[PDB]
Amino acid sequence: AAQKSFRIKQKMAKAKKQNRPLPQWIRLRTNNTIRYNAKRRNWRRTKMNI
């Protein structure tokens, strides 16, 4: 919040990383069933509660 604890900054870093589309090669795997990334987050829609 413009002056952070490292605990909060770390979690912020992990959330950034998790925020990417489904790596499209996984779709090609044998017996693959994952169509898309069903856990995509967005700051303007769902707040991540610290």
Binding site: F6, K9, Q10, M12, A13, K14, K16, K17
Partner: protein
């Protein structure tokens, strides 16, 4: 510019640079990248040319 262990402080960078690259370090500035990684801005004394020492390690 090096990606550096989060556990490493400004001293351990300066030392680990000299040992691994045979260079004199003037000063070391660090920051935590916004993905939980450490970035060292390592500046060499005027004797060493960074550009040369950069394609001596290989990247370019």
């Amino acid at each position: 510019v090096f990606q550096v262990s989060m556990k490493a402080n400004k001293y351990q960078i300066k030392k680990a640079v000299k040992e691994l690259y045979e260079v004199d370090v003037l000063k070391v500035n660090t920051l935590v990248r916004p993905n939980g990684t450490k970035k060292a801005y390592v500046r060499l004394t005027a004797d060493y040319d960074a550009l040369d020492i950069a394609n001596r390690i290989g990247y370019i």
